[PDB]
Amino acid sequence: VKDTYTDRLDDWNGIIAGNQYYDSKNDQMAKLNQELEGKVADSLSSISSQADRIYLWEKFSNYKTSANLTATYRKLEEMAKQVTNPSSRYYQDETVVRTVRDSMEWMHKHVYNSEKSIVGNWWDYEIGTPRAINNTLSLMKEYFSDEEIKKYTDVIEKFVPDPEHFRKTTDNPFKALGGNLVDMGRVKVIAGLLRKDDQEISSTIRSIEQVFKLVDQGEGFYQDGSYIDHTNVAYTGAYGNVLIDGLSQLLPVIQKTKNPIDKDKMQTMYHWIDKSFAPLLVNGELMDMSRGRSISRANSEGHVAAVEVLRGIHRIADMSEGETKQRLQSLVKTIVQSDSYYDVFKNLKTYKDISLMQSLLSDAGVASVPRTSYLSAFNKMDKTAMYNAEKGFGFGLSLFSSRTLNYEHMNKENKRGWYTSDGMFYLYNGDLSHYSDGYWPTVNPYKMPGTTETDAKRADSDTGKVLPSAFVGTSKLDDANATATMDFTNWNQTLTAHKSWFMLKDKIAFLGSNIQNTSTDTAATTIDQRKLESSNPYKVYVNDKEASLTEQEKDYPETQSVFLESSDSKKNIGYFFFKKSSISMSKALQKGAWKDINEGQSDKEVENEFLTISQAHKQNGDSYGYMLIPNVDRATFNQMIKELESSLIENNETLQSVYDAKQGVWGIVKYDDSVSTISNQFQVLKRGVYTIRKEGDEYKIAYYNPETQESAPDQEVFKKL
Angle (CA) 58-61-67 rounded to 5° is 120
Give the CA dihedral 323, 326, 327, 329, nearest 10 degrees: 160
Gyration radius from the chain CA atoms: 27
Q: Which does 232 bind (CB under 5 to 8 A by kind): ligand XYL, ligand PVC, none?
A: ligand XYL
Among 190, 405, 443, 632, binds ligand XYL (CB under 6 A): 405
Q: Which of 13, 230, 241, 608 is catalytic?
A: 230
38 vs 468 by CB, closer to ligand XYL: 468
Q: Which does 123 bind (CB under 5 to 8 A by kind): ligand XYL, ligand PVC, none?
A: ligand PVC
CB of 423 to ligand XYL, least distance (A): 17
227 vs 578 by CB, closer to ligand XYL: 227
For the chain, report the end-to-end CA distance as a whole number of angstroms: 81
Which whole-number Å values give the CA distances from 163 to 156, 176, 185, 204, in the listed order?
Answer: 12, 8, 8, 5
Establish whether 110 is a catalytic residue.
Answer: no
Considering only CA atoms, which of 233, 215, 318 is closest in space to residue 272?
A: 215
Site for ligand XYL in 359-388 (CB under 6 A): 380-381
Among 403, 434, 587, 595, binds ligand XYL (CB under 6 A): 403
Residue 273 CA to residue 279 CA, distance in Å, equals 9
Residue 466 is a binding residue for ligand XYL (CB under 6 A): yes
Residue 442 CA to residue 437 CA, distance in Å, equals 10
Residue 648 CA to residue 625 CA, distance in Å, equals 8
Count of Cβ atoms closer than 10 Å to residue 28 Cβ: 18
Establish whether 230 is a catalytic residue.
Answer: yes
Q: Which of 13, 19, 68, 180 is catalytic?
A: 180
230 vs 333 by CB, closer to ligand PVC: 230
Stretch that binds ligand XYL, among 111-119, 308-316, 398-406, 658-666 (CB under 6 A): 398-406
Residue 543, CA atoms < 13 Å, CB-side half-sphere: 10
Considering only CA atoms, which of 200, 69, 197 is closest in space to residue 126?
A: 69
- Is the Cα dihedral 439, 440, 441, 442 positive or negative? positive
In sequence order, the β-bridge partners of residue 660 are: 665
Site for ligand PVC in 219-238 (CB under 6 A): 230-231
Considering only CA atoms, which of 477, 496, 267, 470 is closest in space to residue 380?
A: 470
Element (DSSP H or E) covering residue 443: none
Residue 232 is a binding residue for ligand XYL (CB under 6 A): yes
In sequence order, the β-bridge partners of residue 285 are: 282
184 vs 228 by CB, closer to ligand XYL: 228
Q: Which of 90, 125, 239, 671 is catalytic?
A: 239
Residue 121 is a binding residue for ligand PVC (CB under 6 A): yes
Site for ligand XYL in 188-227 (CB under 6 A): 217-218
Among 231, 536, 550, 636, binds ligand XYL (CB under 6 A): 231
Residue 450 CA to residue 525 CA, distance in Å, equals 7
Q: Which does 489 bind (CB under 5 to 8 A by kind): ligand PVC, ligand XYL, none?
A: none
Site for ligand XYL in 411-450 (CB under 6 A): none
Among 410, 589, 661, 675, binds ligand PVC (CB under 6 A): 410
389 vs 466 by CB, closer to ligand XYL: 466
Site for ligand PVC in 169-188 (CB under 6 A): 174
Residue 172 is a binding residue for ligand XYL (CB under 6 A): no
Which residues form the catalytic set?
180, 230, 239
- What is the contact surface with ligand XYL in residues (CB under 6 A)? 217-218, 228, 231-232, 380-381, 403-405, 466, 709
Under the rule (CB under 6 A), what is the footprint of ligand PVC? 121, 123, 174, 230-231, 410-411
